[model samples]
Target: EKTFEQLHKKCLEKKVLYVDPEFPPDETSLFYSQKFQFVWKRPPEICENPRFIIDGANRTDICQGELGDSWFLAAIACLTLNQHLLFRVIPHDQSFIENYAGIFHFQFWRYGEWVDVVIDDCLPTYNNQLVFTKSNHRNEFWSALLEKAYAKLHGSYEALKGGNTTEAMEDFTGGVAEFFEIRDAPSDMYKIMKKAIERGSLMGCSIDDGTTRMACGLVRGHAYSVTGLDEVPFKGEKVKLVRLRNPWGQVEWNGSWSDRWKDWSFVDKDEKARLQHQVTEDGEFWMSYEDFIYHFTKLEICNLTAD
Candidate 1:
């Protein structure tokens, strides 16, 4: 397997764009189902001014496309929360401009080793738009290319169809992954999560309703990124809260702390400003930590060892 540098410089030397033979621009590179009229195209073919990153990467950049791999998307969302770690997975180099060779590379933590996955800019598209992981900015393409590199790592895009956030996080950081049922969780689970959030750990949670979405807008058996943790004023005492973001980019938690966040009078006007956030297009929301454990059936954590 050739590294990104070798293929990139070689393409520049030949004054031609890189076309990966290892992962061709064909149906086999996607999935077994040839039923789809899958068309492949490069970044410039889709957007006029293709960019590797626009104003730097953020959680909003991840908008899941026509794929059932929200688990992988959730892990990617968490990666954006921390720029330092995000750069490790998505190197600062390899852009569509400057070195216009149509080649890109991404790094992933695989079983305690970092592996560099290289790929051509060719991406699966339909009607001249991305069909998988996409970015909010139409021109930004790092997210899509990184997804392609990961798909290549697992043979085909279908191989990444279903998974847990723990898998992607562990693969992204070479971190220790832990999965546990919320029902059987220890009494100190809050402490564990708090410490993890402070330690720059990646985490996610989900319910196991098997494709059924709850009335509160939470999708069952779907993965979501745990974005934040805090203690807010409840009635007279402090109450713990957890934050989450759905990969779909909309339809956040509609339960308490959402539509009707019961007992807001207990918190001062200034406290309310700090505790509450507008439910924007990000699909991010906050919920009582107690409600989180009650509604969410599973927890996934990937803690990195400080170097």
Candidate 2:
């Protein structure tokens, strides 16, 4: 069978039109939100030098928009950390310049099979601005397209509202997700998470209640992507740290181990240079495992392996 790119090119060459069955550009479609004034638009019109993917996807690549799909975006952030996994969900072969066709496709593991979801470059917009999940770079369109395809798969973008990250992780990676309540987790949870990171597992966490109140600079009940787990030396001691990224792409942990915390000074000069840690408001930061356990209520790990 021809890949989506091949099929898209053929359809264009034949002067045939393509309409997405799952997410048609009609009022009945799930992506259309009456309240948000959704409109369809292409890349070039959206931003200059528009690209399908950007300089390798990173946790900070995704920026939450008007939609409440933090769960899905968190999963996407974790997926970007691993190239192999990211490529599985977003095929790296197609782009605006190489394959100028407006159609694009993404793959998702639905139930027991991998399904290719095709969509046009047209995106939902409000006042000529994107209305849902978008990239940190205005020209990049991968995250928005991925979200559209997943929304098509699940019946609508609205369907993705406020969900568990594990469900989205499973769909994106075709892996089994193990969930844990941080409060009741075993004592070796940090070690297990570190091991999971080494094994290319995707992880995310969230608080118990939905409150805007900031605890140690973290919003309560907001979904966060687990970007890294490391044991770094500080003050002549090995400190276990967990790297987290907020889906909103701003705001971060402000307590111990945070970017501005005084504890960062304890690291040796060489180690600091090697780490290249920078303080930015880009929504990515590190926190102590103990603080992580104390602030977050739920933990999710999607192991790519069957075992």
Candidate 3:
């Protein structure tokens, strides 16, 4: 098994930077300059400069592939390569390595140009590949590791869930897709979906009257991508959630926001006016991470046996 110490030591030797695009640095805005924008217009020189490709995936960035996560990963990877995502994911601090910002930046196709994004998320020992190896098998291993990580972050199978229009947009813009697949073997979908849900996957369910709805009985139950999360101040409540939504241009739930939710034909009207829980046809939704776990099950989401 890989250890954190080993990964950190080798990463240091390789001079690999660790960044998280969910956060970026202030210098990011500077790249928007017209001169830099002109450089972005050039077709990505990936074929000439292979570092632009991720080791395992062989895509523009090794960290991303045809996987749905392309949407999120691309943004982070591109931004990190551009330094913007790097500064955002892991802002400059006295604690960081000197002259070694621990950030990797890249660019991707966006609006007919290469836009920079940073991938702040680092590959931990749990990522299934250590720093000392290089091979296609390693790529497959890393790819699977990333897939499982994403799957665990959301409560859904990478394959079973597809046809997402919003995910398509994110991926198109170099963002990783928040998608998964459900297999038909002995594996359990609920458990697989639950791991992701528990970790951080956004759900399509909600709570009302102090009760939440769970179980397979709910119609059109599906999971979608999360843009990000924030803590809001509730009256006397420690925190409230500010969630983004993706409507997919269609309503599929049978619950409250469901055309059938709370006896409402459509949540269309309220969706337009609200920001925290704004609704869209983008196939996105907002709910407390706590509430999401409370209603979802994690019994058998992983490929391994539960001890």
Candidate 4:
């Protein structure tokens, strides 16, 4: 392995994203909340002395310093290390972060070792945890990243799931790539996602349907990330998903868009709609967290450890 100085130099020129000379103190320690069991349990003695809490029981989210982009970074970590080929796409120190530009280059180990993959995209994260800063190429970047991750991982999207907090943290810390480099008109984001899946990108979506009330229900089929919900009338804002039901839209949620959603006599129509979501049996619907995870399967958030 290279000496720390060599690696540090390369990291400065390459992977370092936003090394603010006035970089704020990493009081990330303050964001830690003791209310979370996953945080207390997983990192074990690591963050506790400083007071950090993990997000959600599934360990999907972890406490980061002060930035919400931690989630996006975490997703990056998942895409890169969940598989072997993906891990070798870039030199260990080739990819780094820069302010205003979340620069990343791919390095992976092939056959017996690691190799560099050139940078083709400079997709930056928007203020709201979006994958793209340039709205025009948002979908294109999503498709590219998802496609590349799948191709490298042999078409398995599972690379994004089932790991502890540390694993999740490592993925984010290590897989940081430059954001938004592609200059193509963003295609129908969903279309690009579907094409990626067809080309062997593994993905899934939360649908509305379940034999029982479980967290986001069971797996229905794969889906692409649609635009997050923006400008709700009053309920504030949340993530919105446009998903296709693999069964071809025969079933639907009993709330909202469902015939049962209009059944006010059974219960308050709004309450029913609130608990349930509008899902066409055709497998496509506009839904929020409750309906998405309740009726469909829980999306996997891949975990990665530092390499």
User: In lDDT terms, which candidate is top?
Assistant: 1
Error of 2 at 89 (Å): 1.0
**Model 1 error, position 290 (Å):** 1.6
- Which run of 10 residues does model 4 get worst, by summed lDDT? 37-46
TM-score of each: 0.92, 0.91, 0.24, 0.24
What digit string (tens of lDDT, one per residue) describes model 2 on residues 195-218?
Answer: 898788999998878446585788
| Candidate 3 C-alpha lDDT tens digits along 90-158 | 223312224333433333344645444433223323133332112132323322233332332233223
Candidate with better lDDT, 3 vs 4: 3
How much lDDT does candidate 4 score? 0.29
Model 1 lDDT per residue over 174-209, tens place: 888888889899999988998988888999999987
Q: Candidates' lDDT values, in order?
A: 0.85, 0.82, 0.31, 0.29
lDDT of 4 by residue, 44-159 (tens): 11222211111211111211222222233333323332334233332233221222122223444344334433322222232423221111211223223322232233222223
**Model 3 residue 251 lDDT score:** 32
Q: C-alpha displacement of 281 in model 1, angstroms?
A: 3.3
Better of 2 and 4 by TM-score: 2
Number of backbone-clashing residue pairs for each candidate, in the order shown? 0, 0, 77, 53
